[PDB]
Amino acid sequence: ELQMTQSPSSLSASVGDRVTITCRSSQSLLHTYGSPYLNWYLQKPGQSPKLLIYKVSNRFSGVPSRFSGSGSGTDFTLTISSLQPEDFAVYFCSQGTHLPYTFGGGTKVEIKRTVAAPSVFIFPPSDEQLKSGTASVVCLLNNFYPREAKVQWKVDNALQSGNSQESVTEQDSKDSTYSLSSTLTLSKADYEKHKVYACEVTHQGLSSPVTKSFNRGE
């Protein structure tokens, strides 16, 4: 194979910082097919990869000037002189000149910004839902940039253990913020078995852990 180790695996840099990503070609075949001509890409979530640099150094037609690819021997380096708000994506090196074509591990680039506290919202389970035989209550955290967040579900101050799932949106391309939604699912009988429902959100941008509650039935 044509293994390539990409470094780092993840990164956060403020808009305007210099960033360098490294790919190491395989010493196994620096003498089998010579020194390879690497290509660099970036991929947005759900989009096709966009070519940035081809053949080590050549900047692809239309790519901005802030991107540049260097390299000598077997160490190749993509360089972003000053990050931009739209530059958050997954960057990876490509090698498509000798079979089998291989790709780099990838580098997820996050945009740094000031600590932002999330606005919390709690939602009871729908009325037309419980008539099916299951209840799921949703807690919302909107627009924050310490993606590391904590949300505890409580029913009568009974900390739940393993009946909740979270999902976090990709970084917002407008304000570089995240949003999280924890969904606590339990039986209909278990729903009408209690009355208080709260999510305790602990967060870097919060002095006191916020709690959004609601009692069953108005």
Partner: protein, 216 residues
Amino acid sequence: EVQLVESGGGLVQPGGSLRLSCAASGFTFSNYWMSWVRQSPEKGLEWVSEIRLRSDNYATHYAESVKGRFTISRDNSKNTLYLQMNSLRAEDTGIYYCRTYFYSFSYWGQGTLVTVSSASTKGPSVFPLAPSSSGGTAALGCLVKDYFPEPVTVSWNSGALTSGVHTFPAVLQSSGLYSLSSVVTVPSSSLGTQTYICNVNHKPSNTKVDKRVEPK
């Protein structure tokens, strides 16, 4: 403008078959090589197959993982690339990107999702997230629950509402069915004046549902 449009992806049982298409335009299709490259969340990118020119006796190459099962073929007349996939497995799941090679560099298509599972297509049921009663700004949304396979698309007021919307990535549940939540922040001055509707579309099952969210 170089364009590569994939087609044919979808749900298929283990051992079933599928043939992907790729409509090419913007260049002379007969003069450059073609290839397929798939991508999974757990393994990342992975080259699949490649086909040479007619000059090269249509020489094909395959990744060892798919040898004997996948067949790459081109039709210069129709300007399309095909990938016949037979005896599909688990590691075959993922988005399949169509490629063309100008030697100096390559170009990629939007990709087509190929899901291999034992489950049948399940239509989502939509449930409202009624707003509460942060002062001036309120939040509401729709809970798309119990569906398979991916994906589902959500809009608001038939696309008329795009500001402040957040559709969360689906989460695979203990049941093997996906679940997704879509919310939007709106001024509380409009809850009683503005009709808020989410347009859920699960194309794999033709479940286009419109559920207006009312305050309880």
